[PDB]
Design a protein around this ligand. Structure first.
Ligand SMILES: CCCCCCCCCCO[C@@H]1O[C@H](CO)[C@@H](O[C@H]2O[C@H](CO)[C@@H](O)[C@H](O)[C@H]2O)[C@H](O)[C@H]1O
Ligand SMILES: CCCCCCCCCCO[C@@H]1O[C@H](CO)[C@@H](O[C@H]2O[C@H](CO)[C@@H](O)[C@H](O)[C@H]2O)[C@H](O)[C@H]1O
Ligand SMILES: CCCCCCCCCCO[C@@H]1O[C@H](CO)[C@@H](O[C@H]2O[C@H](CO)[C@@H](O)[C@H](O)[C@H]2O)[C@H](O)[C@H]1O
Ligand SMILES: [F-]
Ligand SMILES: [F-]
Ligand SMILES: [F-]
Ligand code: NA
Lengths: 125, 96, 125, 96
């Protein structure tokens, strides 16, 4: 039950952030909606920093770890919204931006995970 | 707040039995445009066909000379909120 | 904006909760490509695809239900960040073949399930 | 419920000043193993080094002949709940 509240509180803040950022920015550049990209990049960054940080604080309450990762990052990032954007582009015959979206989302999210991990790793060293 | 309806629908070239139409794409992911045409005098079947989202022109053939046609174009488009939906039409009248 | 916020939170919380339950139950069974995280992305891909075809045919559906299913449920259920750390960990573990396989199976799998969801409903109607 | 601690830690080959150790990997994504070693008797300093997660063997060098060493291995691993964390150790005694 305490773990469930972590997922819901964190998840709700994540989902809400995604919704606000997406409705505000997605329509600015429809070939690669930047609101959906930014939330995936930002979640990639937070989970990377969480990765490095939680390793060094092994006595942190599982509540906070679960609220940040499964909750916030899990709620903030989205695979389904990325997929329909890509699916729509494929159906529109816009194959170059369908590929670019997939690559920029995947490559971008892993880069931001690395940046999050190594910035904190370099700070502690 | 971004319009999904095409703009500047016009007949760019014409023969007595055909029309080449063009329009400006709306700033949204258009999957396909749907072109409709029929005789303005409300006593004829309206016909429709699609064109891909990449194209912003279409040819209408098999028309009768000296007849008024109502021609409309709308989009089947992707947006964030609505997913796949249909836009309102933009519409013109043209006499062959 | 308050009624829209409850749609995102109610849908998002059910999605995040489902992801959490399915992930803790199944991810540890096959750690090279955690199946709980895959299943939720595949399932969200399926739901958003069926939503794609269905909402097109019901244009007078309340924006509340569309927002609860897409931004809420599918957005909360799917995850890009959890997919990224799994892949990042594999890269750091020197397990490059499963890092690539995870990325491909998640992306290709999620688009396939979006297509299946869209075309099954399109063929029914 | 899946253990992240290695199993069957053993010395597979030995010289007077070195040990080749091996272990069975736990069924989790191990990022690196941490090998520790120190003289079983009392208060020599325990030393550690890491080995990549792909490897399931390590060489310990610079040991003294005829001395009892306590050797432990633990993992730095990824799991769903805990992210990066450290396992409990598995431990053995060996006399060079
Ligand atoms: C890597 C994983 C992949 C997973 C599978 C996803 C498949 C997505 C594409 C399927 O949708 C089709 O896409 C065609 C291409 O856009 C469309 O063709 C449309 O556009 C073409 C122009 O490119 C015309 O020739 C066609 O007649 C016209 O139907 C067609 O309507 C649409 O149903
Ligand atoms: C994401 C996973 C699936 C990826 C699909 C496979 C990878 C395809 C690589 C790019 O393909 C090219 O894309 C151009 C740009 O889209 C097309 O342009 C041509 O064809 C288009 C057809 O839709 C026209 O709209 C263009 O004007 C015309 O230049 C061209 O034919 C096509 O070979
Ligand atoms: C597709 C776009 C991707 C963009 C982002 C990619 C970010 C990936 C970060 C990888 O992190 C490194 O991975 C190495 C490789 O696993 C590790 O080497 C470790 O493991 C190796 C395996 O043999 C050893 O050779 C090294 O000495 C040892 O440090 C190293 O520690 C770790 O920091
Ligand atoms: F998905
Ligand atoms: F992400
Ligand atoms: F993954
Ligand atoms: Na999510």
């Amino acid at each position: 039950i305490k773990s469930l509240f972590a997922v819901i509180i964190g998840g709700s803040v994540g989902c809400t952030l995604r919704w606000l950022l997406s409705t505000k920015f997605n329509s600015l550049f429809p070939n690669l909606p930047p609101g959906t990209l930014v939330v995936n990049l930002l979640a990639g960054l937070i989970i990377g920093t969480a990765l490095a940080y939680f390793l060094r604080q092994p006595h942190l309450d599982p509540f906070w770890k679960l609220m940040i990762t499964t909750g916030l990052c899990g709620g903030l990032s989205t695979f389904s919204t990325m997929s329909v954007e890509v699916f729509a582009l494929l159906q529109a015959g816009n194959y170059i931006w369908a590929l670019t979206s997939v690559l920029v989302h995947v490559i971008g999210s892993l880069i931001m995970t690395a940046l999050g991990f190594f910035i904190i790793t370099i700070l502690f060293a | 707040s971004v319009s999904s309806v095409p703009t500047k629908l016009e007949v760019v070239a014409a023969t007595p039995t055909s029309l080449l139409i063009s329009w400006d794409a709306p700033a949204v992911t258009v999957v396909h445009y749907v072109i409709t045409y029929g005789e303005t005098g409300g006593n004829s079947p309206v016909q429709e066909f699609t064109v891909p989202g990449s194209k912003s022109t279409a040819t209408i053939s098999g028309l009768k000379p000296g007849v008024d046609y109502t021609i409309t174009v709308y989009t089947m488009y992707y947006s964030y909120s609505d997913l796949y939906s249909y836009s309102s039409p933009i519409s013109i009248n043209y006499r062959t």
